[PDB]
Amino acid sequence: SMNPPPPETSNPNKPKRQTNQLQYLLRVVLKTLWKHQFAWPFQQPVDAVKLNLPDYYKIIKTPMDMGTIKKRLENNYYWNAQECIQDFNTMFTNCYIYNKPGDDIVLMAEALEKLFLQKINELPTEE
Ligand SMILES: Cc1ccsc1CNc1cnn(C)c(=O)c1Cl
């Protein structure tokens, strides 16, 4: 079973903003997670072919990854911070739903999620 098309990172029909919260989401939140030692499995869409996960996209119908989020932030895809926060949460949720407690990938997601929560706890108020 092939990979699906990746999530959209460009859509000229979609209204966009550059906001201080979205800037924080790139400069602080994404940056922190991206540089982490456990970031690598999450830096691009799950390649179900290479990774021999033929049931992945049967189970996971809203795929998300930090490669996609990074592109969405750098290319100003979002209207608001909540959209981006939802993408991160979708990414973590997918990992927990597909895998089992104590799997390496789940421990990796937990570490990244801890940092995610720490950083969005201090999301600045809108300017
Ligand atoms: C590359 C790697 C590292 C530990 S397990 C694994 C392959 N499978 C993966 C990869 N990424 N993600 C997000 C998954 O949920 C699954 Cl199950």
Swiss-Prot record:
Indicate the cross-link positions, Glycyl lysine isopeptide (Lys-Gly) (interchain with G-Cter in SUMO2).
58
Question: How this protein is processed and modified after translation, per its record?
Answer: Phosphorylation by CK2 disrupt the intramolecular binding between the bromo domain 2 and the NPS region and promotes binding between the NPS and the BID regions, leading to activate the protein and promote binding to acetylated histones. In absence of phosphorylation, BRD4 does not localize to p53/TP53 target gene promoters, phosphorylation promoting recruitment to p53/TP53 target promoters.
Record domain Bromo: where = 17-123
How does this protein assemble? Answer: Interacts with p53/TP53; the interaction is direct. Interacts (via CTD region) with CDK9 and CCNT1, acting as an associated component of P-TEFb complex. Interacts with RELA (when acetylated at 'Lys-310'). Interacts (via NET domain) with NSD3, CHD4, BICRA and ATAD5. The interaction with BICRA bridges BRD4 to the GBAF complex. Interacts (via NET domain) with JMJD6 (via JmjC and N-terminal domains); the interaction is stronger in presence of ssRNA and recruits JMJD6 on distal enhancers. Interacts with NSD3. Interacts with NIPBL.
Report the disease annotation for this entry. Cornelia de Lange syndrome 6: A form of Cornelia de Lange syndrome, a clinically heterogeneous developmental disorder associated with malformations affecting multiple systems. It is characterized by facial dysmorphisms, abnormal hands and feet, growth delay, cognitive retardation, hirsutism, gastroesophageal dysfunction and cardiac, ophthalmologic and genitourinary anomalies. CDLS6 inheritance is autosomal dominant.
State any further remark: JQ1, a thieno-triazolo-1,4-diazepine derivative, and I-BET, a benzodiazepine derivative, have been tested on tumors with success. Treatment with GSK1210151A (I-BET151, a I-BET derivative) has strong effets on mixed lineage leukemia and promotes myeloid differentiation and leukemia stem-cell depletion.
Free-text note regarding domains: The NET domain mediates interaction with a number of chromatin proteins involved in transcription regulation (NSD3, JMJD6, CHD4, GLTSCR1 and ATAD5).
Could you identify this protein by its name?
Bromodomain-containing protein 4
Q: Which organism is it from?
A: Homo sapiens
Q: Which residues of the full protein are shown?
A: 44 to 168 of 1362
